[PDB]
Symmetry: C2
Subunit: 257 residues, 2 copies
């Protein structure tokens, strides 16, 4: 080959659409595995840990990968917190797979004067929670947003996503948050860190234009769009900026070009 030596891949909308799998998507992983190519999964979904994902992967879609190949926004979040080093105390709004991981990273749950206030998706959000966070932020805590996604795909349709919840807090505190997830650099920098190869020979693969393809454009990384998820192959034209490559199915992508 001698083109792209490492691959960053989105999950939902790319490898599996809800509970229904993506044939091509699954063949895409096998070829990468078979050809011994380096690749990393990147998702802004913080509700599930790596282990929990690799399982759902090797249990509902027959894809077999170690949990280390699943790089989530939660990972880049603990990574940024450590790197920012503003103390151990933290307050969080999110599902367990976000709170558990963080606290397991060395931080301490603090609802009054935490050093950090991390906000992610929480389907059990309550007025009280954002009240805690608003007070915490007002006292100085650093406001962190897990990912800017305004919505999130479910069996009921497009529900409110991490992004929408973050904005709720942002509005109540008139404070811009530090976003971690795609298309922000933070998660991407860390991703390339794990992948193991440098940007010039790496390429972001995904179905969504707002998060996946932007991850590439925002950070100097080639992108490959697959019209199998969100953005239809109809919207390919009109897109503010074209992705490095456009394919209607990963089966049309050859690791030689």
């Amino acid at each position: 080959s001698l083109d792209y030596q490492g691959y960053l891949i989105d999950l939902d909308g790319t490898i599996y659409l809800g509970k229904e799998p993506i044939p091509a998507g699954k063949r895409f992983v096998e070829r990468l595995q078979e050809k011994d190519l380096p690749f990393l999964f990147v998702t802004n979904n913080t509700t599930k840990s790596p282990e929990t994902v690799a399982q759902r992967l090797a249990n509902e879609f027959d894809i077999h990968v170690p949990a280390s190949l699943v790089y989530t926004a939660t990972l880049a979040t603990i990574d940024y917190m450590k790197e920012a080093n503003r103390g151990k105390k933290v307050f969080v709004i999110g599902e367990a797979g976000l709170i558990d991981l963080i606290l397991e990273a060395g931080f301490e749950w603090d609802e009054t004067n935490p050093d950090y206030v991390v906000v992610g998706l929480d389907t059990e959000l309550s007025y009280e929670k954002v009240v805690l966070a608003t007070l915490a932020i007002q006292k100085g805590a650093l406001f962190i947003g897990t990912n800017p996604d305004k919505n999130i795909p479910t069996e009921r349709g497009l529900l409110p996503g991490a992004g929408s919840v973050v904005t709720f807090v942002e509005t109540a505190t008139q404070t811009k948050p530090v976003y971690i997830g795609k298309p922000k650099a933070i998660i991407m920098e860390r991703a390339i860190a794990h992948l193991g190869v440098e940007k010039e020979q790496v390429i972001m693969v995904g179905d969504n234009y707002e998060t996946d393809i932007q991850s590439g454009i925002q950070n100097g990384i080639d992108s490959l769009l697959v019209t199998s998820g969100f953005t239809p192959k109809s919207a390919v034209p009109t897109l503010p900026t074209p992705p490095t490559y456009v394919v209607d199915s990963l089966d049309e992508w050859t690791f030689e070009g």
Copy 2:
């Protein structure tokens, strides 16, 4: 200097204010050179080449440094353009300095259908100019904003800055731009590369909280604030989040932590 091994410093408002030099600023550099501590100047100012700056710095402020130690948003901009690797055609809005270096690189001036549309602050901005960019961006051109700062300080006061002009184009095209300068990652990822010392042992130094201090917290890099430029010592108390350190003169800072 066990603590910080690499320094990133702002220029205007830190080393000098207009045509008047900041004594403490100069001594600051002298001590950094006497201790062999590596450092790198990083400014969002694009009106002059690193060479021009260094010359002025040496023959007008008695601060001797090779031009290679002056990293500009411009440099960061051309780096991004090449990294993005789209066409070579470009359309730009700004002062000669910005336009010249971009053209002096390997780009070609194209007002009709350029591959990139770079927008910076242009004091001779005209309606026609934003028209050309609007159209070009409508055709697919990647929209690039030099730096987000909304205003700019001058003899006359707080005038509209790069950020404002960018926003003007943004509204006409309803397209978000990719920002290059402080506090954005792009310029900082590049800044750290030239500095050579690893991120956790580097500290950003500056007078402006929103541009400099923020470039620090936004990218997981320690901050050092000097209440000498923009941000006064009175505002320090109400800041959204404090810089890693606050000082009222670079003199007060020693290289032992």
